[PDB]
Amino acid sequence: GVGDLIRKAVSVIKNIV
Amino acid sequence: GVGDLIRKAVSVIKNIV
Amino acid sequence: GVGDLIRKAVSVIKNIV
Amino acid sequence: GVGDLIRKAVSVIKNIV
Amino acid sequence: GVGDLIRKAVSVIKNIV
Amino acid sequence: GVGDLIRKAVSVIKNIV
Amino acid sequence: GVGDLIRKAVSVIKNIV
Amino acid sequence: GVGDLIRKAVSVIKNIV
Amino acid sequence: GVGDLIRKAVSVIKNIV
Amino acid sequence: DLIRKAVSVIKNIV
Amino acid sequence: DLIRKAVSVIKNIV
Amino acid sequence: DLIRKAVSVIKNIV
Amino acid sequence: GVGDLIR
Amino acid sequence: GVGDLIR
Amino acid sequence: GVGDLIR
Amino acid sequence: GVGDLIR
Amino acid sequence: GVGDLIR
Amino acid sequence: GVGDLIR
Amino acid sequence: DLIRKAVSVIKNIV
Amino acid sequence: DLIRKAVSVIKNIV
Amino acid sequence: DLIRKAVSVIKNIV
Amino acid sequence: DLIRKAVSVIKNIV
Amino acid sequence: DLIRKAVSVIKNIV
Amino acid sequence: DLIRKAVSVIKNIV
Amino acid sequence: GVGDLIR
Amino acid sequence: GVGDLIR
Amino acid sequence: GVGDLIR
């Protein structure tokens, strides 16, 4: 819109043994 | 809209043994 | 809208042995 | 000053019929 | 000053019919 | 000053019929 | 961690006459 | 970590007369 | 880490007379 | 009959 | 019958 | 019958 | 609709 | 629609 | 539509 | 260690 | 270690 | 270590 | 004696 | 004695 | 004695 | 009369 | 009379 | 009379 | 003013 | 003003 | 003004 701000942070981990 | 702010943070873990 | 703020934080864990 | 924070949000509406 | 923060958001509407 | 932050957002609407 | 927030503000004064 | 935020502000004064 | 943010602001004054 | 039907609708979501 | 039907619609999403 | 039908539509998304 | 404004 | 404005 | 504006 | 998974 | 996965 | 995966 | 000793350790700090 | 000693260690810091 | 000693270590810092 | 008049002023706004 | 008048002013705005 | 009048002014805006 | 500091 | 500092 | 500093 007008002056909007968006932040996204994602972390994924898969340990298979 | 006008001056909006959005923040998202996600973490996922899968340990399979 | 006008001056809104939103924050989301999520954590998921699955330990399978 | 030191570490201050200020937030202002304003909305005005005028419907004339 | 030192580490200050300021945010302003404004919305104005005029419907004339 | 030192490390200051300023944000301004403005919206204006005029519907004349 | 996930979505954490930390704020610190400090002021020190020493007047010696 | 994931989506973390940190803010620090410091002020020091020494008047010697 | 992932999407981290850090801000530091410092001010020091020494008046000797 | 000058203006048989007149209608106004206003929606403001803020 | 001058203006048989008149209609106005206004939507403002902010 | 001068103006049989008149219509106005306004959409503002901000 | 029908709105009269005179100022 | 039908709007009269005179100023 | 039908809008009259006179200023 | 010793983990058996069958799906 | 010793992990057996069959899917 | 010792990991067996069959899919 | 097939597997004399088996050990698993999992630490999750979030 | 097939596998005398088996060990697993997992550390996740997030 | 097929595999006398087996070891796994995993460290994830995020 | 060595120092007839001495004055000090300190203002700190934080 | 050595120093008839002495004055100091300090203003700190932070 | 050595130093009839002495004055100091300090302004710090931060 | 008149300030004496000795350290 | 008049400030004496000795260190 | 008049400031004496000796260190």
Author numbering:
A (entry chain A), B (entry chain J), C (entry chain S), D (entry chain Y), E (entry chain P), F (entry chain G), ...: 1 to 17
J (entry chain Z), K (entry chain Q), L (entry chain H), S (entry chain T), T (entry chain K), U (entry chain B), ...: 4 to 17
M (entry chain a), N (entry chain R), O (entry chain I), P (entry chain U), Q (entry chain L), R (entry chain C), ...: 1 to 7
Paper text:
Supporting this hypothesis, we here determined the fibril structure of two AMPs from amphibians, uperin 3.5 and aurein 3.3, by cryogenic electron microscopy (cryo-EM), revealing amyloid cross-β fibrils of mated β-sheets at atomic resolution. For both of the studied ffAMPs, cryo-EM data unambiguously prove an amyloid cross-β structure comprised of β-sheets with tightly coupled dry interfaces and strands perpendicular to the fibril axis. Despite the dissimilarity in lateral fibril structure and the difference of extended versus kinked β-sheets, the 17-residue ffAMPs uperin 3.5 and aurein 3.3 are remarkably similar in their residue composition. Overall, compared to other amyloids, the sequence content of the two AMPs indicates a dominant apolar and positively charged nature, which fits the functional interactions with negatively charged bacterial membranes.
The cross-α form was also recently shown by the crystal structure of the antibacterial peptide uperin 3.5 secreted by Uperoleia mjobergii (Mjoberg’s toadlet), which forms fibrils with amyloid properties. Here, a cryo-EM study of uperin 3.5 in the absence of lipids reveals the presence of β-rich fibril polymorphs, and the atomic details of the cross-β configuration, allowing for a direct comparison to the cross-α fibril and exposing the substantial polymorphism of the same sequence. While the unique morphology of the most abundant polymorph (type I; relative abundance 71%) makes both individual fibrils in the micrographs and two-dimensional class averages easy to identify, variations between the other fibril types are more subtle. We find a propeller-shaped structure with threefold rotational symmetry about the fibril axis, where each of the three asymmetric units per filament layer comprises three chains (labeled A, B, C, along with their symmetry equivalents: A’, A”, etc.) of distinct conformation. An atomic model of the uperin 3.5 peptide built into each asymmetric unit (propeller blades) shows excellent agreement with the data in the inner section of the fibrils, comprising full-length (17 residues) monomers in chain A, and 14 and 7 residues in chains B and C, respectively. Chains A and B are tightly interdigitated and form β-sheets along the fibril axis, both hallmark features of a canonical amyloid cross-β fibril. Chain C is almost perpendicular to the other two. The center of the uperin 3.5 propeller is composed of inward-facing Arg7 and Leu5 residues from chains A, A’ and A”, creating a positively charged and hydrophobic core. In the cross-β fibril, Arg7 on chains A, A’ and A” is buried in the core of the fibril, while on chains B, B’ and B”, it is facing outwards, but with the charge being compensated by interactions with Asp4. Inaccessible charge of Arg7 in the cross-β fibril might support an inactive storage form in contrast to interacting with bacterial membranes.
